[PDB]
Every structure is written in C-alpha cells, then in structure tokens.
Structure 1
Amino acid sequence: MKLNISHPANGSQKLIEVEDERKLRHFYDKRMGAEVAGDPLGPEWKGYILRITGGNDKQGFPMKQGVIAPNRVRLLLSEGHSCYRPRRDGERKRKSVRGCIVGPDLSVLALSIVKQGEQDIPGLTDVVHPKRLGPKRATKIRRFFSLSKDDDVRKYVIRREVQPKGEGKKPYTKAPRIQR
C-alpha cells in the first residue's frame, strides 16, 4: 500500500511506503473529514493529528463524500459533482464510485497534517514552499498591506523578475494588472 502525505502549512508533498498491515489497523472505520491521532504510526510521529482527505482504489477509482458504504456503488451524476466533467451543457452520466468508509481494499491513501508534534519529519517539515502569485484585485492590496482608504494603493504592486533570452539583455519586470 502507498501513502501520499501533504503539508499545507509549508506547502510540501511526499509519498511513503508502508507494508505492515498491523500498523494501519487503527483506521478501517474512520470516515471522510474526521480527526485521528497519528502517533501509533511510529516514534518520530508522536504528537501528530491527521485529517483523512481521500484515496484511490486498486483499480483507480476515487471515493466521494456523502456515500456511506465500504463497497462501491453506481450513481447518476449531475452538474457540480466531484468526479465528473461533462462535455456538453446538461449531460448526466451514470458512473461508479467508492464509499466513504476506509477499508483494507484501497490502493493509495492520502493525509494532511493538522497539528505538529515535537520531532520533525525528515522530508516534509524541513523544507517550506512559497506561494505562487500575489493578489491583483484592488481591495486585496489595501487589506494585505494594511493601507487606508486614500493611500495610493496602485504603487504597491508585487512584481516578478524576468530575463530576456536575447544576447543576455538586462532583465525587466512583470506586474499583475490591478482590476476594479
């Protein structure tokens, strides 16, 4: 079985191999969106609480919030559902989905950290990843940089740095196109 662990605080992701069925007997009744103590995983994981986000079956099928069953069921999907993207306005396709009860059948599980412990994870909490793009709507800059109603918000626009590939010409800057 495979586990895909993600850390939203620092924004990092890793996957770990676990082969001991005895270690994972502690779930197998937990639902989607619940709390659990990750301490019995091991000593370096003491003082951790995990949130169950979802997984993939052995065939590749995902699970869907709101269907209470350990098996998989066919349903009549519509617009707005989680595991279907229609190709034309108004389509409704019948598909098969996995229930919201964890079991020994799943092929890959996935979890997120809610509260850390004292030990550190050798590949997860030691590196931190930044965000990708700053704000661009007018109200966002004022609240973000705490300016008042009349503080010339336009000037404070976070900009990126880009280098032209032409004869190593001196780079220039790129900006977010303030709206409203």
Structure 2
Amino acid sequence: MKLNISYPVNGSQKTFEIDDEHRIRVFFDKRIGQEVDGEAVGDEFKGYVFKISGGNDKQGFPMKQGVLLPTRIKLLLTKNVSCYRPRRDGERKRKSVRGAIVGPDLAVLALVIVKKGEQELEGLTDTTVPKRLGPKRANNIRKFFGLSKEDDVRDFVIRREVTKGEKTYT
C-alpha cells in the first residue's frame, strides 16, 4: 500500500509504496493518532516515528478520525465535519466513510513524521520547501519577529519580488 508521509518541519512530503505485508502489518489494528516505530516498517526508517493521520482505501473513500471499526459506514455529515463540504446553508448529506482503524484494504496510509531517525530520507529531510504566505495582520507581524509594539510594523512586513519582463517588482 502507498504511504503518504509528511515532514511538517520542512513542509516536505514524499510517497512510498511498501509491499511485503509483514512490514505493512505494523499499522494494522492501529487507530488514527497512535505512533509507530519505523524500524518495523523498514530499515531506511529506523528510529523514525510515524503518526497515523488518515488515508483512503480502495474505491477512494477517506478515513474519518475516531470512527473506529476497520470498515466502512455511512454517516450523516454536516457543517464543520470531515469528509464533507456542504453545498447549501444548513445542508447535510449521508455519505460513505472508511473507519479510522488501519486495514489491508487501505490504498494509502497518510503519515506524519514525529521523530527523526538515523538516516536522512530521500526527498523528505534532504529538502525543505518554504512557507507560502506571510503575516498580514498587524499584531501577527509583531509576534513573528517579536516586535514589542514600538517597532513600526510598516517596515517589518514581508516583501515578495516579482519580475515583469525587464521590470522586477515588489
């Protein structure tokens, strides 16, 4: 099954395909939220700890947290709820949902690094991707740089350069 791992420190994320069910078997009967020692998944992840965050089984149905039962159910999903974006004010639909207990029918296990191991992963620790946006509210700037509200936020806002053919802008 495919493994959708993420290193939230660098914003990195690479996918892995693990065959050899003995290695997959570690995640079986584990819920979303429990931590996994990677040494059992493989050797490249030795000392790496993984957070189980979700995933989609075959037929692409997502997992929903805390909905135990390594099977599918059909919940009545509402506003502010996982695996559902409404279409009308006060709209609910009954949709299928895959449980939060890992099973062999999962196409992809979504994983989150919690502790680094002893070997840099290929495109996960070796590379880092910067955050997209910057602080736009006044006080959030004062707390991204620790500004002590006398330091004139107007100069501490972030500027993003951009090229227009032969005119570099800001």
**TM-score class normalised by the smaller sequence:** over 0.9
Q: Residues 62-92 of structure 1: CA distance to partner in whole angstroms, max 9, x if unpaired?
A: 1111212111111211211111111111112
User: Which residue of structure 2 aligns with residue 172 of structure 1?
Assistant: 169
- AA in 2 matched with 1:75: L
Paired-residue identity, %: 68
User: Which residue of structure 1 aligns with residue 96 of structure 2?
Assistant: 96
User: Which residue of structure 1 aligns with residue 19 of structure 2?
Assistant: 19
DSSP-derived class of the 2:23 partner = helix
User: Which residue of structure 1 aligns with residue 69 of structure 2?
Assistant: 69
**TM-score normalised per structure 1:** 0.89
DSSP-derived class of the 2:114 partner = strand
Count of paired positions: 170
> Offset of 1:19 from its aligned partner?
1.4
DSSP-derived class of the 2:5 partner = strand
- AA in 2 matched with 1:118: E
Q: Residues 37-80 of structure 1: CA distance to partner in whole angstroms, max 9, x if unpaired?
A: 11112222211111001111111101111212111111211211
Q: Residues 74-131 of structure 1: CA distance to partner in whole angstroms, max 9, x if unpaired?
A: 1211211111111111112111111111111111111110010121112211111111
User: Which residue of structure 2 aligns with residue 6 of structure 1?
Assistant: 6
User: Which residue of structure 1 aligns with residue 130 of structure 2?
Assistant: 130
User: Which residue of structure 2 aligns with residue 116 of structure 1?
Assistant: 116
How far apart in 2 are the matches of 1:16 and 1:91? Answer: 37
**TM-score normalised per structure 2:** 0.94
| Runs of 5+ unmatched residues, structure 1 | 174-180
Q: Contact 2:72–2:98 at 8 Å: present in 1 too?
A: yes
- AA in 2 matched with 1:53: S
| Runs of 5+ unmatched residues, structure 2 | none
Q: Contact 2:2–2:15 at 8 Å: present in 1 too?
A: yes
> Offset of 1:137 from its aligned partner?
0.8
Q: Contact 2:26–2:41 at 8 Å: present in 1 too?
A: no
User: Which residue of structure 1 aligns with residue 60 of structure 2?
Assistant: 60
CA RMSD of aligned residues (A): 1.3
DSSP-derived class of the 2:59 partner = coil
Higher radius of gyration, 1 or 2: 1
User: Which residue of structure 2 aligns with residue 79 of structure 1?
Assistant: 79
- AA in 2 matched with 1:6: S
